[PDB]
Amino acid sequence: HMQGSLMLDIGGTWLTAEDRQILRHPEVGGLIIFARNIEHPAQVRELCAAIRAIRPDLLLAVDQEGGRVQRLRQGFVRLPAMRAIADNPNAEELAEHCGWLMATEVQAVGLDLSFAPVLDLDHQRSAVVGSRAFEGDPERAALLAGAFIRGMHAAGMAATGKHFPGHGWAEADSHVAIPEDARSLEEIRRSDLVPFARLAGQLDALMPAHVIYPQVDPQPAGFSRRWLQEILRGELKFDGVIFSDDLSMAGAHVVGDAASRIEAALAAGCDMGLVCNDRASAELALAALQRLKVTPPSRLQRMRGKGYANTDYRQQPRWLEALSALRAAQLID
Ligand SMILES: CC(=O)N[C@H]1CN[C@H](CO)[C@@H](O)[C@@H]1O
């Protein structure tokens, strides 16, 4: 009667026999890679193909926006930070070139999508979105992110928005602490949420933050049916998938058990649960999804990469023009 899925995580260069046996479960619908899973480009290509040899229906994602955190390093251009593009005069063109460049480079390795860009605003308040946020003005960041997403769509990758409904004002970090944002209801509509409302029709995937808004819903935004159903789906006209954020870090312990985390996330309206950095918590969630007999949402296949990317992306006119256009701003490698 309900729908949902699970995105796993491996902690090795190649697949362990245990990883193969947990993949085959239908409730698993994705895999996130980190620094510990990456050696060289060809290594990641055979790692993907090794997973596709088990489940060609899975979708593989990477944490690659090119700033403080860029997982794919050797063999990949040093993408700039989103704040490094704001000062430049033609930011609307550098965004399209930056989005297309990184999306083609990661799709040619084998991954489907990349959790990028971030739609948060740089209020100089949050320690996690330092250089990740585009700019401070809401409309400036909404136009820049729309151009960045425009480049990814031209590359064939579905874009994911982070982090709904806003994480730049939350002074506390959600990786170790529990962020709380006591801003009023109507102010968020005029400030942090503006980029999310502008790109709701141009976006295919969202990631709610784990910040608490006591004005809106005592539970975090990822676990709030008022945030995900009443405001996002019912008001912001959004219709794509809703990727849960990492359900293993701190800030998500408001509900309790690892299994109870994905219970509250799927009951809130999200389409997929994200648990990484811990295999045991992923097994408890998997066993949970097997119990209520989750069905893979028909919206998830929209996020699989349609990329025409081969090893050919090195020889295309967009490749040379975007290289020169981004090299002029002293951003790329
Ligand atoms: C708030 C935040 O930045 N969360 C990150 C947690 N880890 C995920 C998997 O790498 C990322 O997608 C989120 O950005």
Q: Which protein residue has the closest C-alpha to ligand 1 atom 10?
A: 63
Residue 115, ligand 1, Cβ within 6 A: yes
Domains of the chain: 1-333 (3.20.20.300)
Q: How far is the CA of 228 from the centre of ligand 1 (A)?
A: 18
Q: Collapse the DSSP code of 198 into the 3-class scheme (helix H, G, I; strand E, B; otherwise coil) and give the result.
A: helix
* Tokens standing for residue 52: 């596709």
Q: How far is the CA of 241 from the centre of ligand 1 (A)?
A: 16
Contacts of 7 (CB under 8 A, 6+ apart): 28, 29, 30, 31, 32, 61, 243, 272, 273, 274, 275, 276
Give the residue ranges of the annotated binding site for substrate: 63, 71, 132, 162-163
Atom number of ligand 1 nearest to Cα 163: 1
Residue 63, ligand 1, Cβ within 6 A: yes
In contact, 104 and 313? CB cutoff 8 Å: yes
H, E, C per residue of 38-96? CCCHHHHHHHHHHHHCCCCCCEEEECECCCCCECCCCCCCCCCCCHHHCCCCCHHHHHH
In contact, 268 and 245? CB cutoff 8 Å: no
List Cα–Cα distances, 319 to 88, 314, 333, in angstroms. Answer: 21, 6, 14
* Tokens standing for residue 189: 């509509």
In contact, 114 and 157? CB cutoff 8 Å: yes
In the chain, what is the greatest distance between 2 CA atoms, to the nearest angstrom? 55
With 0-12 / 13-18 / 19 or more C-beta atoms within 10 angstroms meaning exposed / middle / buried, residue 117 is buried
Structure method: X-ray
Q: Which of 281, 164, 303 is nearest to 220 (CA)?
A: 164
Atom number of ligand 1 nearest to Cα 63: 10
Residue 128, ligand 1, Cβ within 6 A: yes
Q: Sheet containing 205-208: which strands, arranged edge to edge?
A: 113-114, 59-62, 28-33, 6-9, 272-274, 241-246, 205-208, 160-164
d(CA 207, CA 118): 10
Backbone φ and ψ for 120, nearest 5 degrees, come out as -70, 160
CB environment 238-273: b (16+ within 10 A), e (fewer): bebbbbbbbbbbebbebbeebbebbbbbbebbbbbb
The DSSP element (H or E) to which 124 belongs, if any, is none
Residue 278, ligand 1, Cβ within 6 A: no
Q: What residues are labeled active site?
A: 175, 245
Q: Which protein residue has the closest C-alpha to ligand 1 atom 8?
A: 246
Q: Collapse the DSSP code of 154 into the 3-class scheme (helix H, G, I; strand E, B; otherwise coil) and give the result.
A: helix
Residue 71, ligand 1, Cβ within 6 A: no
In contact, 270 and 243? CB cutoff 8 Å: yes
In contact, 63 and 243? CB cutoff 8 Å: no
Q: How far is the CA of 164 from the centre of ligand 1 (A)?
A: 12
Q: Which of 74, 25, 16, 8 is nearest to 47 (CA)?
A: 16
* Rg of the chain over all Cα atoms, to the nearest angstrom: 19
Q: How far is the CA of 246 from the centre of ligand 1 (A)?
A: 6
Give the residue ranges of the annotated binding site: 63, 71, 132, 162-163
* Tokens standing for residue 164: 């709904």
Angle CA(55)–CA(269)–CA(284) in degrees, nearest 5?
55
The DSSP element (H or E) to which 8 belongs, if any, is strand 6-9
